[PDB]
């Protein structure tokens, strides 16, 4: 069994039980799940994901403070990743803020303000949820 954890806040985010697809040229992970009623998202309820909200400036302030934190973790763990990290993120941050009204925010269990903020949206069918994480801010245990 594979468990993907946040590299910063050490919070449980998701596992390999869902469909994992790669997007943004290897920058973000596309975790495909389904709606289960025990009604909620299976990926959210199974990993203690705490929901939060951000404004256009607070998220831009956070994502600038968080993407810098991941770049520092790459400089100590995978220095060759720093170059493709800033390139795809600059295009991705401009893609997230452009579609800011379509994403929902979630944080780790500890609710650390420095942790990862996950995004949630729906496919063209409107009922299949998929979550967007940062691939470089995860540790595979």
């Amino acid at each position: 069994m594979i468990i993907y954890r946040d590299l910063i806040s050490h919070d449980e985010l998701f596992s390999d039980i869902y469909k994992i697809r790669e997007i943004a040229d290897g920058l973000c992970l596309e975790v495909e799940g389904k709606m289960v009623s025990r009604t909620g998202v299976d990926i959210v309820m199974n990993h203690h994901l705490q929901e939060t909200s951000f404004t256009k400036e607070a998220y831009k302030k956070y994502i600038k403070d968080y993407m810098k934190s991941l770049k520092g973790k790459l400089e100590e763990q995978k220095p060759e990743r720093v170059k493709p990290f800033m390139t795809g993120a600059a295009e991705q941050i401009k893609h997230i803020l452009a579609n800011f009204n379509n994403y929902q925010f979630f944080i780790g269990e500890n609710m650390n303000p420095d942790g990862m903020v996950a995004l949630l949206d729906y496919r063209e069918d409107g009922v299949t949820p998929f979550m967007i994480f940062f691939k470089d801010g995860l540790e595979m245990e």
Side-chain angles (χ1 to χ4, degrees), residues 1-18 20-21 23-31 33 35-37 39-55 57-59 62-66 69-70 72 74 76 79 81-82 84-94 96-108 110-134 136-141:
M1 182 188 187
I2 310 178
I3 300 178
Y4 299 94
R5 304 175 176 275
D6 195 342
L7 184 57
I8 306 298
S9 60
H10 303 286
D11 289 329
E12 181 179 353
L13 298 188
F14 67 99
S15 59
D16 61 327
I17 312 177
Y18 322 100
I20 306 178
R21 292 303 177 98
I23 59 178
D25 294 331
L27 185 64
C28 295
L29 293 179
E30 188 180 26
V31 182
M35 299 299 300
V36 295
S37 304
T39 304
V41 181
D42 60 333
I43 316 173
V44 178
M45 303 180 64
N46 292 327
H47 303 279
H48 265 188
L49 299 184
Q50 310 292 340
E51 184 183 359
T52 183
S53 62
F54 293 99
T55 54
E57 187 178 358
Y59 177 79
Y62 159 81
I63 198 59
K64 283 190 297 183
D65 299 332
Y66 179 68
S69 302
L70 297 188
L74 291 177
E76 63 179 359
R81 189 68 182 152
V82 181
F85 175 78
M86 299 299 299
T87 300
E91 212 299 306
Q92 188 67 22
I93 294 180
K94 292 182 181 295
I96 296 182
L97 291 180
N99 305 268
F100 184 83
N101 298 327
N102 305 114
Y103 294 111
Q104 301 181 3
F105 312 96
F106 300 94
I107 55 182
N110 291 331
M111 297 188 60
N112 211 321
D114 303 333
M116 186 188 299
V117 165
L119 304 176
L120 175 58
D121 196 26
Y122 292 87
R123 294 271 206 175
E124 52 184 354
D125 61 336
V127 297
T128 301
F130 65 96
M131 303 191 64
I132 298 180
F133 296 87
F134 290 110
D136 304 286
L138 298 176
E139 47 180 355
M140 304 181 179
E141 177 70 28

